[PDB]
Design an enzyme around this catalytic site. Structure first.
Site, PDB file in Angstrom:
ATOM      1  N   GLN A   1     -20.196 -18.983  13.566  1.00  0.00           N
ATOM      2  CA  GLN A   1     -19.523 -20.038  12.815  1.00  0.00           C
ATOM      3  C   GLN A   1     -18.668 -20.913  13.725  1.00  0.00           C
ATOM      4  OE1 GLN A   1     -20.998 -18.195   9.160  1.00  0.00           O
ATOM      5  NE2 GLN A   1     -20.378 -20.290   9.715  1.00  0.00           N
TER       6      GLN A   1
ATOM      7  N   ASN B   1     -24.622 -21.099  13.837  1.00  0.00           N
ATOM      8  CA  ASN B   1     -24.511 -22.403  13.194  1.00  0.00           C
ATOM      9  C   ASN B   1     -23.961 -23.444  14.144  1.00  0.00           C
ATOM     10  OD1 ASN B   1     -25.390 -21.695  10.483  1.00  0.00           O
ATOM     11  ND2 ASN B   1     -23.435 -20.605  10.270  1.00  0.00           N
TER      12      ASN B   1
ATOM     13  N   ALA C   1     -28.736 -17.909   3.495  1.00  0.00           N
ATOM     14  CA  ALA C   1     -27.713 -17.524   2.535  1.00  0.00           C
ATOM     15  C   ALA C   1     -26.495 -18.431   2.569  1.00  0.00           C
ATOM     16  CB  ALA C   1     -27.290 -16.074   2.759  1.00  0.00           C
TER      17      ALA C   1
ATOM     18  N   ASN D   1     -26.365 -13.835  -3.113  1.00  0.00           N
ATOM     19  CA  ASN D   1     -26.622 -13.308  -1.768  1.00  0.00           C
ATOM     20  C   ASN D   1     -26.912 -11.810  -1.893  1.00  0.00           C
ATOM     21  OD1 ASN D   1     -26.886 -13.110   1.022  1.00  0.00           O
ATOM     22  ND2 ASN D   1     -24.755 -13.667   1.477  1.00  0.00           N
TER      23      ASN D   1
ATOM     24  N   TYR E   1     -27.829 -15.906  17.139  1.00  0.00           N
ATOM     25  CA  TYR E   1     -27.945 -16.780  15.970  1.00  0.00           C
ATOM     26  C   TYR E   1     -26.605 -17.445  15.676  1.00  0.00           C
ATOM     27  CZ  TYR E   1     -29.429 -18.286  11.294  1.00  0.00           C
ATOM     28  OH  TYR E   1     -29.751 -19.016  10.182  1.00  0.00           O
TER      29      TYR E   1
ATOM     30  N   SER F   1     -29.072 -21.078   5.217  1.00  0.00           N
ATOM     31  CA  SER F   1     -29.696 -21.203   6.543  1.00  0.00           C
ATOM     32  C   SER F   1     -31.162 -21.652   6.554  1.00  0.00           C
ATOM     33  CB  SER F   1     -29.536 -19.905   7.342  1.00  0.00           C
ATOM     34  OG  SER F   1     -28.192 -19.754   7.789  1.00  0.00           O
TER      35      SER F   1
HETATM   36  C1  LIG Z   1     -24.001 -20.184   5.693  1.00  0.00           C
HETATM   37  C2  LIG Z   1     -24.137 -19.158   6.780  1.00  0.00           C
HETATM   38  O1  LIG Z   1     -23.405 -19.165   7.754  1.00  0.00           O
HETATM   39  N1  LIG Z   1     -25.107 -18.259   6.604  1.00  0.00           N
HETATM   40  C3  LIG Z   1     -25.166 -17.085   7.279  1.00  0.00           C
HETATM   41  C4  LIG Z   1     -24.248 -16.354   8.052  1.00  0.00           C
HETATM   42  C5  LIG Z   1     -24.746 -15.154   8.573  1.00  0.00           C
HETATM   43  S1  LIG Z   1     -26.403 -14.953   8.069  1.00  0.00           S
HETATM   44  C6  LIG Z   1     -26.482 -16.419   7.173  1.00  0.00           C
HETATM   45  C7  LIG Z   1     -27.709 -16.854   6.453  1.00  0.00           C
HETATM   46  O2  LIG Z   1     -27.698 -17.980   5.925  1.00  0.00           O
HETATM   47  O3  LIG Z   1     -28.701 -16.097   6.389  1.00  0.00           O
END
Ligand SMILES: CC(=O)Nc1ccsc1C(=O)O
Ligand SMILES: CC(=O)Nc1ccsc1C(=O)O
Ligand SMILES: CC(=O)Nc1ccsc1C(=O)O
Length: 358
Positions: free
Chosen positions: A117, A149, A315, A340, A147, A61
């Site tokens: 997502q 994507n 992450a 992670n 939040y 992210s």
């Molecule tokens: C790749 C992705 O969706 N990352 C995600 C999902 C929940 S938090 C988070 C992050 O990248 O911090």
């Protein structure tokens, strides 16, 4: 590096790596503008490949900061504006709930509850259109932050439409190349595969899988050196020669919405500096970070404030990253890991490093 920096960095990162069982880590500290680099552990456990300053990490992210700046640049070029309806660039989005949803809303997670997502079942561009057409908002535009994507990802894809460039081409030509990020990639080239770390999830070596709007939302991979340069560029946007890019960075660090102690930028998130460590640390936990929260509009947005803690957590399945900086102090940090591990641990470590150096 100065002994002070070394001591501060090592006393913090050593126990972190041990507590979290992180296979490999790279850290950069930007102190009075300069970069200082530190590496530990393994990029590839199986093949016994160490983490180096050339190792590529999946940013997850943290990629949203690049998306935000690329978007900012498009605004600076006069190609788009954040006040444009989403339908201006995706006219096929004719469903009535899209009335009143602007690029700003998309960029700042405030469209009205677009999901974290894009559904995995979305395989084709026809599937993607259907998904957005059928999506029902829980809330009116610009009232709640969630939040997502599927929100900033769509912003990224639409922001580059007037250019007539693909998202990757735009990012490469307008952000990576001008800033000399020559080891930063949306798609890792065969030539650079040697440097691509494996991520580790439940003991397994993993890389991020293809997904809709991956490039826009979470798809950048980078080295500790390039990420240090990215921090320097964001600390001092004025030193950037390319006018629209300079303005894009400033637009990205502008404050569009407030929730609790935090402000939403484009990709970047900001807090007033000095910060309460407990608000950045606790606030970074996904309990809060991924929660739907009411937002107060900043009308009009506040231009990038130099007295800020600007940061982004990120992450993938196999990676955890964090970037934070304080423009006022010329101070910053990048933490890249191939595990992670929980956000609050990342922010806690960053705080104790930057606090010691400020
Ligand atoms: C790749 C992705 O969706 N990352 C995600 C999902 C929940 S938090 C988070 C992050 O990248 O911090
Ligand atoms: C638009 C996009 O990112 N591609 C797309 C759309 C539905 S699935 C998919 C993918 O890249 O896998
Ligand atoms: C060239 C191009 O992609 N143009 C395009 C596609 C959807 S909206 C738009 C525009 O230039 O506004």
């Amino acid at each position: 590096a100065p002994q002070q920096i070394n001591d501060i960095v090592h006393r913090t990162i050593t126990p972190l790596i041990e507590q979290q069982k992180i296979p490999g880590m790279a850290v950069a500290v930007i102190y009075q503008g300069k970069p200082y680099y530190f590496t530990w552990g393994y990029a590839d456990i199986a093949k016994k490949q160490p983490v180096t300053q050339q190792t590529l990490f999946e940013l997850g992210s943290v990629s949203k900061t690049f998306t935000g700046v690329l978007g900012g640049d498009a605004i600076a070029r006069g190609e788009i504006k954040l006040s444009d309806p989403t339908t201006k660039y995706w006219p096929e989005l004719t469903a009535k709930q899209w009335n009143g949803i602007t690029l700003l809303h998309l960029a700042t997670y405030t469209a009205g509850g677009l999901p974290l997502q894009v559904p995995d079942e979305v395989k084709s561009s026809s599937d993607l259109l259907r998904f957005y057409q059928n999506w029902q908002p829980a809330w009116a535009p610009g009232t709640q932050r969630l939040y997502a994507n599927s929100s900033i990802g769509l912003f990224g894809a639409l922001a580059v439409k007037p250019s007539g460039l693909s998202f990757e081409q735009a990012m490469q030509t307008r952000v990576f190349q001008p800033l000399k990020l020559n080891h930063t990639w949306i798609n890792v080239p065969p030539a650079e595969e040697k440097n691509y770390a494996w991520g580790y999830r439940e003991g397994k070596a993993v890389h991020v899988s293809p997904g809709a709007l991956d490039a826009e939302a979470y798809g950048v991979k980078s080295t500790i050196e390039d990420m240090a340069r990215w921090v320097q560029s964001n600390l001092k946007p004025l030193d950037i020669n390319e006018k629209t890019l300079q303005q894009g960075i400033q637009l990205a660090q502008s404050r569009y919405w407030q929730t609790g102690d935090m402000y939403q930028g484009l990709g970047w998130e900001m807090l007033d500096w000095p910060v309460n460590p407990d608000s950045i640390i606790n606030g970074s936990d996904n309990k809060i970070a991924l929660a739907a929260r009411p937002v107060k509009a900043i009308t009009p947005p506040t231009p990038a404030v130099r007295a800020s803690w600007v940061h982004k957590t990120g992450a993938t399945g196999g990676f955890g990253s964090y970037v934070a900086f304080i423009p006022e102090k010329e101070l910053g940090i990048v933490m890249l890991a191939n595990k992670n591990y929980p956000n609050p641990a990342r922010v806690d470590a960053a705080w104790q490093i930057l606090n010691a150096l400020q």
